[PDB]
Amino acid sequence: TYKFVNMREPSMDMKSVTDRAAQTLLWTELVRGLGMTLSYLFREPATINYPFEKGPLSPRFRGEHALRRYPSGEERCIACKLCEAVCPAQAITIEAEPRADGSRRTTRYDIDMTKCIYCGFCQEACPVDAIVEGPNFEFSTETHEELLYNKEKLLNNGDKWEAEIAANIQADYLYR
Amino acid sequence: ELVQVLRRGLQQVSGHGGLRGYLRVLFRANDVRVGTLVGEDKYGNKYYEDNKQFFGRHRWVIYTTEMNGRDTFWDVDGSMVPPEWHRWLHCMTDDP
Amino acid sequence: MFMINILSLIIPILLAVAFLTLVERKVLGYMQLRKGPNVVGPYGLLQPIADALKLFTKEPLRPATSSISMFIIAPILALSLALTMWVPLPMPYPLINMNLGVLFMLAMSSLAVYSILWSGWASNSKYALIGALRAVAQTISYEVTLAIILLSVLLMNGSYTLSTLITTQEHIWMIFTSWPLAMMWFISTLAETNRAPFDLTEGESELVSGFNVEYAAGPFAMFFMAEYANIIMMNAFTAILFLGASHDPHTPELYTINFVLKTLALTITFLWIRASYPRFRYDQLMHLLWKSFLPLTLALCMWHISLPIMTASIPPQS
Amino acid sequence: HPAAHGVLRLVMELSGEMVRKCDPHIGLLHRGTEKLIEYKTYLQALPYFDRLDYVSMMCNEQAYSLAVEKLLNIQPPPRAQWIRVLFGEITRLLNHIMAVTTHALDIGAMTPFFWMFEEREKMFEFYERVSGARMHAAYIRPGGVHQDLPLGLLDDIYEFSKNFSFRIDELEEMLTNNRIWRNRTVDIGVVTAEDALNYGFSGVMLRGSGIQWDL
Amino acid sequence: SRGEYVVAKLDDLVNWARRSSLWPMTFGLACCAVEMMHMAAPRYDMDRFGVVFRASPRQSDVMIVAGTLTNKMAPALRKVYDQMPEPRYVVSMGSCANGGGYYHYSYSVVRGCDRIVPVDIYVPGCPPTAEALLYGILQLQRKIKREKRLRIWYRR
Amino acid sequence: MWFEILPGIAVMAACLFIPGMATAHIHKFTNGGKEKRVAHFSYQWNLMERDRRISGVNRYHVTKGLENID
Amino acid sequence: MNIMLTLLTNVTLASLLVLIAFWLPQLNAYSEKTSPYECGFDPMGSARLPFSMKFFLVAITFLLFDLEIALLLPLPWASQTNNLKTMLTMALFLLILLAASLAYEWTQKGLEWAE
């Protein structure tokens, strides 16, 4: 089922001919366009006062990565390396060994933030909610090297954003 | 209704703590609206809301003038917002 | 004391031009559901100063293939002519009182095109050459119609003296007698100042930057200053020509305020038109000027020659 | 070049301003995506299709998911299919806004772009609320969608859709009947139905010539 | 010292002028540019900060590399960077420009635009949100504010 | 908003006030305060030259009335 | 005398602005910065090559139509003559011939650009 967009014939009576001639000589549709712009002039603009006002986000927002802890302070990560296997950009590098107490923990956990595509597959693949994409998005640097995150940087990110991260996970975890 | 908007302007002048407060807010945030205070940081940022403004302008923060070590009277950025007020300010929650 | 008057004419025009850019950015923004500059100073009042300081502290470059003499000469000619074309305007008194001010203004307008032409040719780039040839085509399109419209309108004035236009429109605006020509005249001004929808010499979406693509920093700023000054000047000329303010010999400030307000209205109308319309193709501009504007202009010139003789309304001062 | 979309090198032979020959040089954005796909799993390969046509993300996601589901001989659940069609039409709205407004900007009408990009921002908010990404959602996957809709999303979509028609009306008031727009667009780039079929065209480039075809 | 005070004030003035009027080149490569187009959209309105796109490299101040840089395109990017008059700044936007991103291991992709041009700000994301890009430009403004060219000249 | 466009416009208006007003004042300051004479034709110039010659101070705008016919 | 002073002042101000723009900032000129611009690449040919004019006939006609302006400008003064009938006849005749020239070129496809 279809319709035509440009298949209408103008009427040839004297009234229509005079209307079209007056349109040509007096520029009525151009005045209509001017009126549309003038109408927009007196509308309230849609601009927000950044950085004092921020754009709306969601609990599902994928921002800066972070490594989480259990309420006791123990690391959630167990070096299963699922995030490394699933990473479409190979942005994660992991090395592990038994800890001094025999625990299964990482010794290297690096994310190349200039390789990352910020897809969130790593936090889907994680079985213990150890690695997350946080809500932060304002972390521009001045050198390339500052965007090569090691385990200390990610643990600091987790310790710094845990209050917001836990609330977002509490809001979202029943959809996952 | 012109006198009404003029009186609203004078009210915005008077509600910022005098002419000096009006000028401080004009040259610090390029805005002179007045809203109900929601709370304050331990760093000095004050958070205001106004539900009569459209979505995006209904929540805002007046940043502090002195964060951890630097003078932020003019040098402000969005990274100074702590995570809890970050969640409130970006409308990921309806609760301060 | 005459040099003081020259300076009091030229410096405020530049200041006005600088602020005009700010107004256009804000007017365009609010017509596009945004704000425009409102951060650099209160309401963006310091933005033009920042733009000027940035432009005049940046490095200018001489293209390796360019012809240096003409490359340097063209912006000087543009800005000097833009400044010169204000001296015969009665506001309500002119800095220079000429018997033939309209013809002088026409000649200086005709000379102003060569800044664009020589900048485009001396840049020695392909896009600049295309912009210069578009300028040639634009002049060929609009020149004769503009001149004949001026002649037909001034047939009711009695002379080419600009100040006489104040006496001619003492009781009624000339537009009420020549509103058709006025419309055409308005369009001609849009073509004369290379303004949208006839911004073809620059043509950003087609020629990157057109004739001034190779210009940077101060010379580019001078080209911008000249163009905006010409915009304000032509709108002031239109206001004097078609919307005659009543002049009090003992209170000339009333005339000055009226004239300035009318000029600002016409300039804001220019900005509105830029915000409202797409761009012509530069052959379509010539076809519009030669196949629609020229026949009506010739017929109306005939009618305006016959009209004062028919009604016994020939103006004085042979 | 403002009209070259950043990565097109159009070598043109001109006589005056009349175009004698157009030779498009492409590959300035060739990233070797198809070779990269051969080293990824199917789920790992999914996010490449977001970046294929980054004006219509979920439509490419849907095409890839349909291909993989056809090869797997499985069926997505009905609610996933309805969500797919809804977000595909939202994506079509985004793509057509971008196309029409950038076209008008190229001709010279720069105002409707700003009017319609606020609507684009609202649909980006819908994308982010459903997936957490404004553009590269990766939401549509072989088997269905990644997550269910959050509560209240349908109401906001209805609120946007009940007002989008007036924005279309304003754009049409600006462009459709303008004589400058018609002078710039009427009888420009005319292609016949037979030539369009033989040259491999599809979509509007077919339907503009009267060919009654929609997939 | 009077001279130190004078050069400090002049540095302040020139830095304010240069950071309050930042004109980026009309230059984008890939999906990131779309988000850049959303930074000029009414909601964020980059023009309100004094940021205006200009097509000519001679009339521009900032290079925003918004998209993947291929090997076929690198000479053109270097050419239009070289044709920018000084002072000039480069902002690398998105994972592809930062380090290659999703196509890092490709045969035809430059692994980061910093192999071709010096970079002042790196904006992470794939793509960064328009708000994140605005944060990047404001950080670049602060960095320009920290410049002391005339003080360095005076202390030579 | 739109009234936030008004301030810049006002500045422009003030600038555009300066030239004409200045001219008027200057025309009054250098012409005895009485609207600088216009001479488009040689008759007006001859009148001005006669005025200058009979002024007694080489200034056309110094007007001599009936008090000069003793 | 006054117009000469005004012209000298305007030209001097423009030249001083150019001098400031060229002598105040720091210049770093090298061969890549000063090369011609063709949006990413070296131009294939020269910009001094011939550039065809598709509106050449209209350009020539502009020369002839520009002198009708010279002939028609003294009309305000001509309107003050005693024999208004002769003056009106001559002015109308001149405009009629101009219109006939325009019509002749229009009907002979002289206003269409070369392909």
Ligand SMILES: CCCCCCCCCCCCCCCCC[C@@H](O)O[C@H](CO[C@H](O)CCCCCCCCCCCCCCC)COP(=O)(O)OCC[N+](C)(C)C
């Ligand atoms: C007369 C013709 C020749 C001279 C031509 C130029 C004329 C002088 C230029 C006019 C100067 C006015 C500019 C001052 C504006 C500063 C406003 C303020 O914002 O600056 C603050 C502090 O000021 C700056 O640090 C220094 C600028 C002041 C310049 C010093 C005065 C030197 C004047 C000397 C003039 C001599 C000219 C040459 C003589 C030969 C920093 O705040 P900022 O971070 O940005 O904003 C953050 C954005 N927020 C507000 C939204 C959060």
Ligand SMILES: CCCCCCCCCCCCCCCCC[C@@H](O)O[C@H](CO[C@H](O)CCCCCCCCCCCCCCC)COP(=O)(O)OCC[N+](C)(C)C
């Ligand atoms: C708004 C309109 C009004 C403006 C009014 C002012 C007009 C200004 C015109 C242009 C001046 C602005 C330029 C800034 C200062 C001038 C510096 C330059 O012109 O001269 C320098 C002087 O260099 C000379 O070659 C060496 C000096 C020796 C020659 C002088 C001759 C006489 C001096 C002998 C000593 C005894 C004193 C005699 C005088 C009383 C050359 O420096 P250079 O590096 O190339 O160029 C880059 C300049 N930078 C660094 C600022 C970017």
Ligand SMILES: CCCCCCCC/C=C\CCCCCCCC(=O)O[C@H](COC(=O)CCCCCCC/C=C/CCCCCCCC)COP(=O)(O)OCCN
């Ligand atoms: C009893 C005897 C009385 C004497 C007779 C008086 C009656 C006169 C009746 C006719 C008057 C018509 C005047 C208008 C002249 C030109 C009109 C025209 O037809 O031109 C159009 C085109 O004109 C335009 O569209 C203009 C385009 C540029 C638009 C730029 C902005 C528009 C301006 C908006 C506001 C205008 C304000 C003007 C006055 C301002 C005050 C000075 C022709 O082009 P096309 O439609 O494409 O067709 C050509 C093939 N047939």
Ligand SMILES: CCCCCCCCCCC1=C(C)C(=O)C(OC)=C(OC)C1=O
């Ligand atoms: C002035 C209104 C906003 C214009 C912003 C200019 C951005 C320039 C980037 C070039 C570009 C354009 C023009 C463009 O249209 C496009 O879409 C195909 C791109 O790919 C994302 C681009 O990279």
Ligand code: SF4
């Ligand atoms: S967000 Fe995606 S690309 Fe980034 S580390 Fe996680 S899985 Fe890898």
Ligand code: SF4
């Ligand atoms: S972050 Fe999670 S998925 Fe990755 S290695 Fe640690 S426990 Fe395994």
Ligand code: SF4
């Ligand atoms: S970083 Fe991501 S969004 Fe940006 S250009 Fe590369 S693939 Fe596209």
